[PDB]
Amino acid sequence: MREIVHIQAGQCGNQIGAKFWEVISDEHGIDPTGSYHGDSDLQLERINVYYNEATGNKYVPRAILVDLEPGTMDSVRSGPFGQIFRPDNFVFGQSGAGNNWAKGHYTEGAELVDSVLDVVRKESESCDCLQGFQLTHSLGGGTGSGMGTLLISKIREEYPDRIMNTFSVMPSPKVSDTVVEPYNATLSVHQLVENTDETYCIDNEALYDICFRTLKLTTPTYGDLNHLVSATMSGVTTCLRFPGQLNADLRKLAVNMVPFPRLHFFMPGFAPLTSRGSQQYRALTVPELTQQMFDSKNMMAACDPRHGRYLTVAAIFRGRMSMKEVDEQMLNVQNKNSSYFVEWIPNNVKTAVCDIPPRGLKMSATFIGNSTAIQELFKRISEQFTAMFRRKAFLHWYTGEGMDEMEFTEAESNMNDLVSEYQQYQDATADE
C-alpha cells in the first residue's frame, strides 16, 4: 500500500496545495477538522495514500509547508482548512528571498533546508512503502524556485529510487508580474532537467484563457486557477486510491510517457469543463471527453500542440464506461491526426480507466501530453534571458549572494541543449 509525501514551497505552491487538500478532503469525506463523515466504504479503503491516522480516529494530511514569509502560513492557518494540517509541519523563517533565486537557493534557504529535510525524513520513515514525492511551486519567483530546486536535489540525493513529481507554474509569454522572471526560470529549469522524473508545466495565461473562453467566467480570480490545477492533480493519481478496470500507477505513466530521460515536461488538461450555462446541452459521452481533451484550446501550458508532434500522451478516465469505445476513440484520434504523432512510436496513447468518478459528475477525464511544442516556452525564456544577460541587467543582486557568470552560462547552455533535443524530433520525414 503506497504513500505520497507532499511538499509545498512559496506563495503559489502554498495556495495551490491548500486548494488541493480541500478537493481531496471532499473526495474522501474528511471534514475541516479531521473527522470522517463519508457515505461510500471505498473512501477509507485507500486513505493511507495522503492521510496519516491519528489517535482520536482523525486523519491528518501528510503535507509539508515551506516558505520564508510568515504571511502565507498565517493565511493558510486562518482559512476553512487551516486546522486540518498539523502545526509541526509549518516550517518557515523571516526575511524572504524577495524574488532573488540566489537568496532562495544559496544564502537563506541553506539554513531552513535542514529543518525541512528533518520533517521530510520524519514523514517518510513512517510510510509502509513510500512511492514518491510531489512539489508545487512557481518558477518565476524567489523562495519557490530556489527552495524547490534545493529540496529536490537533497531528496534525490537521499531517495534515488522514489518518484519525484512537480507541478510548476512557469512564466507566461506576455503576462508578467516580476521583472526578473527569466533568470529564476532559467536557473530553476536547469536544476529540474537533471533531478526530476516528471514535471507538469502550468501557465497562468492558459488558465485565464480556459476560464474566459470555456467556463465563461467574467471575473476570474486565483481561486479558479487553483481549482483547475487541483482537479488536474487529483486526476493524475486516481488509480492509487480507487479500483478500476485498468489501473495506471505513477510508474506506469512515467515509463509509458518519457522515451528518453531528459524529456519529462508534460502539458496537462482536464475535461469536462462547460459553462454552468450550457451544462444542459452537451451530452456526456466518451467521444465528447475525447474531443475536449485533445482540443488545443483546453491545454494548461499555453503552447499550441499543432506546432509540434506528440511523443506520448496518456488519458486517465474516471467513471463507468466501455473499454471498446475508449480504445476505438484513441485509435480514431491517432488515425485522423496522423501528422501530429511521431512515426517511430507505434500506438503512443496510454489509457487508464478508474471506476469511481469525482463527486457530482457522471464521468471525467484527464490528459497528459508530451509534445515538442513545449520547446517554444523554453525558447521564449531563453530569448528574454539573453536580452538581460548580455548587458548584465540585474546581475549584481545575484552575484552579491555568491554566484558568478559561469552558473548563468551553463544554465543557458543546458536550456539550449534541451530545446535542440526537442527540436530534433519535431520535423517529419526523418530521411533526406
Binding site: 506563495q11 514569509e69 504571511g71 493565511s75 523571516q94 526575511s95 524572504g96 524577495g98 524574488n99 532573488n100 506576455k174 503576462v175 508578467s176 508580474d177 516580476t178 521583472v179 526578473v180 522572471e181 527569466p182 485565464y208 471575473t219 476570474p220 480570480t221 486565483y222 530569448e383 528574454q384 536580452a387 538581460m388 548580455r390 548587458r391 541587467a393 540585474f394 549584481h396 543582486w397
Partner: protein, 451 residues
Amino acid sequence: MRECISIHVGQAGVQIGNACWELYCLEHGIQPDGQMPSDKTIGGGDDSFNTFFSETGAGKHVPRAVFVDLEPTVIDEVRTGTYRQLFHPEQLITGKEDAANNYARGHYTIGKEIIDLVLDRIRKLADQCTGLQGFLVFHSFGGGTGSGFTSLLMERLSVDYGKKSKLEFSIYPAPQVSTAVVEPYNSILTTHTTLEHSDCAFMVDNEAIYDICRRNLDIERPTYTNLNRLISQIVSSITASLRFDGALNVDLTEFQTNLVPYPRIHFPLATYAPVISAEKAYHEQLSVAEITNACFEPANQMVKCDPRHGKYMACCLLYRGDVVPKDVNAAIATIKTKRSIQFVDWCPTGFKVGINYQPPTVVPGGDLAKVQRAVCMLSNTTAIAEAWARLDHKFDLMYAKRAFVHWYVGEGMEEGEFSEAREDMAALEKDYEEVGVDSVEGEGEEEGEEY
C-alpha cells in the same frame, strides 16, 4: 515582524512626518493620545501593527520615529500640538542656531554634538526591533540641515548597520520656483551621500504637486499641508504591503531587486493615479485601466520631467482596494502596445505588480475623495537626467565667480569639495546616458558560421 524606522530631518521632514503619522494613526485606529479603543471594544487583535508602532504594557502605542532638527521651532510646534502625547519625549533638538542654508554648517560645524544622541536613540529603537526591514529617511535638498546632517547621518548609518536597506524620500528643487539663493550648492554637494550610501532615492518636486493640485484636486491656493498629505499617501501606498493582506505582496527588498538594474541608477520617479476631488469623484468610473493609464500621463508626474524624452527601465505598480489581477494584466497589456511609452530593449519584462486589499483612507478635513481603487506607480527611467542637468547649469553660473563661497569655507570645508562633487555629478549623468542607449545593432556585430 516587518518593522521600519522613520527618520525625519529638517523642517520639510518634520512636517511630512506630521502628515504621515496623522495618516498612520487614522489607518490603524490609534487615537492621538496613543490609546486604541478598537482593541478594548472588540477584545483583541493585531491592530497594533509593529511596522510603525511599538506597544507597551499599559496599551499605549509609541511610534517608531526619530525627529531631528537644529531649530527648536518646528519640533516645539509638535511638542505642544494635538499629538503631544503620542511621541516619546525625546525629539533630538539641538538648542542652538540652525545650519543657515549652509551644507558645511550642517555637516561639519554644528552637525556634530547632535549626531551621537541621534545615533544612540536609533540604536535604542533598533534593539527593540525584531526582523528590521529598513529605514525611511525624509529630508529636502537645498536646506542646510536636510542636506548636511542627512549626509552625515546616512554615512554613519551605512558604517554601522551596513546591510539594512535605506530608502530616501527627498524634495528636489524645482526648475523655476525656489525659496533660497544657495539651493544649487547644497543640492549638488548632497550628491556624494545620496549616491553612494542610499539604496533607493525617491524625488518629488513642489511645482509638479502644485500643478496637480490645480488641475486634479481643484484647489487654487494650496499650502504645504496638501503636499505633505499627498506625499504621505505615496509612502502609505509603498509601505502597505507589509501591514495588510493581499493577493500579491511586495516587501521592501523586492522594490530594490526589481527597480535597480545597476547600483548607481537608483533614482525612480513616483506617482499617484486617482488624485481627484469629491465633486469630480462622481461622473468617473475609476476602473483599473483608467488609473493605470493616468499613472503614465506626463501631466501627473510628481517631478517636472517629461517621460517621453527618455526610456523606461523599470516599473512597479502597487494596487490598493477592489482590484482583481485580470484587470491589471489587461491594463499592462494595453500599456505595452502604446508607442509613446518606450522601454529599454534589454528589459523585455519591465513590470512588477503588487495588489493589496486595504483601500486608501480619507483624512478628515482632507482634499482627496473616497475611492474604492488606487494605484501608486514607481518608474525608474532616463528622463530624470534632464531634472539634474538644469541644476548643474545653475551651479556653474554661481561657481564661475565663486559667489557665496566664503560662507561655506568659513565653516570647515575647502574649495575642492565643490569641484569634486560636480565631477561626480557629471559621472552620474554620463552613466544614465550610457544605459538608455539601444544595444548596438546585432550586438555581436554580425554572426553566422557555416551551418
